[PDB]
Amino acid sequence: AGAAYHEWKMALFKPADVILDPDTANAILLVSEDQRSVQRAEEPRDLPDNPERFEWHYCVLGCENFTSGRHYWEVEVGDRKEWHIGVCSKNVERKKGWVKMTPENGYWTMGLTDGNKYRALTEPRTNLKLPEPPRKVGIFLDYETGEISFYNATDGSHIYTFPHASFSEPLYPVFRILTLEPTALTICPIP
Amino acid sequence: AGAAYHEWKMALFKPADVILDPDTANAILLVSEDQRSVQRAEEPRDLPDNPERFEWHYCVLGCENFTSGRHYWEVEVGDRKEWHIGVCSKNVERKKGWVKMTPENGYWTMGLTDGNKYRALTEPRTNLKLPEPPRKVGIFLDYETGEISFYNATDGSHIYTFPHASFSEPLYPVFRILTLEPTALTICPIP
Numbered sequence A, B: 001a002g003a004a005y006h007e008w009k010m011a012l013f014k015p016a017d018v019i020l021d022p023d024t025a026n027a028i029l030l031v032s033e034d035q036r037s038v039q040r041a042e043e044p045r046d047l048p049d050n051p052e053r054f055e056w057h058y059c060v061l062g063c064e065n066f067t068s069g070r071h072y073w074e075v076e077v078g079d080r081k082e083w084h085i086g087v088c089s090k091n092v093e094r095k096k097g098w099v100k101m102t103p104e105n106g107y108w109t110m111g112l113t114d115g116n117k118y119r120a121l122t123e124p125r126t127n128l129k130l131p132e133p134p135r136k137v138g139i140f141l142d143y144e145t146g147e148i149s150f151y152n153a154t155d156g157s158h159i160y161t162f163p164h165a166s167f168s169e170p171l172y173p174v175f176r177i178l179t180l181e182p183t184a185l186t187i188c189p190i191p
């Protein structure tokens, strides 16, 4: 069940060793020293406007992108009451206010808002019903087949899969947090 | 106060999301479908050889181990008249009969026998005197300080702290039940 999940993911997808890129992180984000976790600060840091940095979206990326193959990583979201995670195109508009995070705008993400509302960030947003709140989420990228999927990485249940896409840009792991709370997002070691 | 215990656990220790590993579970144990609970059976299962499995001790482990950091989880023991819980080293002699569960053998555990006799499984065993019987037990690991502690998770009260170890191996949550009875051991998910 969980076991079947682990066997399936290990057979089919390459483990990506994701580390967060402080240079991309909106100034309201604190990336941990080990670059595995990200937290939202109360006050923004005073950081330069280098082209890589998100200036509007409360986002940070992985250091490395994907251009082909099947890849997965897992993110511990624990009890944090707001988070959205997935992948985004390298050429997302990092410097424009109010760009909706949607596949059309180079984002493939899902998560949680207001403690209990699960969504996939489609346009319009898709509401999800998950019998069990995930503590750890498996993100899955099949670049060739154009498929971004999410699983509960502990009990192996399927969370969501985006419609078929035809990727024309490299894809980054992306992480977004809006609220001030205690629990971090953490990229966990993967089998 | 339970309030102080709540604040303390939440400030200092990362909440471990513990799921029982059925491949480790001695064949006389039955792990629930959600792998949050374990019960002792009257008859063993007939299973294929597995290196991970406890052959002698009536034990099951968590799926994940700890190699650094401060971690806690909380176990519902209910009115069950016999149980022992804690952590053990990854390299405990799983396959060997008659190994005493003690710190020298890779185990740091405490619990209940015969309804009313609480013990820490030191060598010798140290008898505990608990003003009230717990129904939920908080297990606390601080890997750097070598500190394994047990608390009454409802009212915050201290149950037992082992002499500080110098851990040189990854640590698993471990769970042992000997006796036949209706109340399972249950891991309460992250609050």
Ligand SMILES: C/C(=C\COP(=O)(O)OP(=O)(O)O)CO
Pocket: A056, A057, A058, A059, A100, A101, A113, A121, A125, A176, A178
């Ligand atoms: C302010 C902000 C994001 C909120 O965006 P939205 O208000 O469009 O809502 P959502 O559906 O969650 O994307 C910065 O990332």
Ligand SMILES: C/C(=C\COP(=O)(O)OP(=O)(O)O)CO
Pocket: B056, B057, B058, B059, B100, B101, B121, B125, B176, B178
């Ligand atoms: C039979 C058994 C465990 C009990 O071992 P022991 O009989 O040595 O007693 P204890 O002091 O509770 O460890 C299988 O796990």
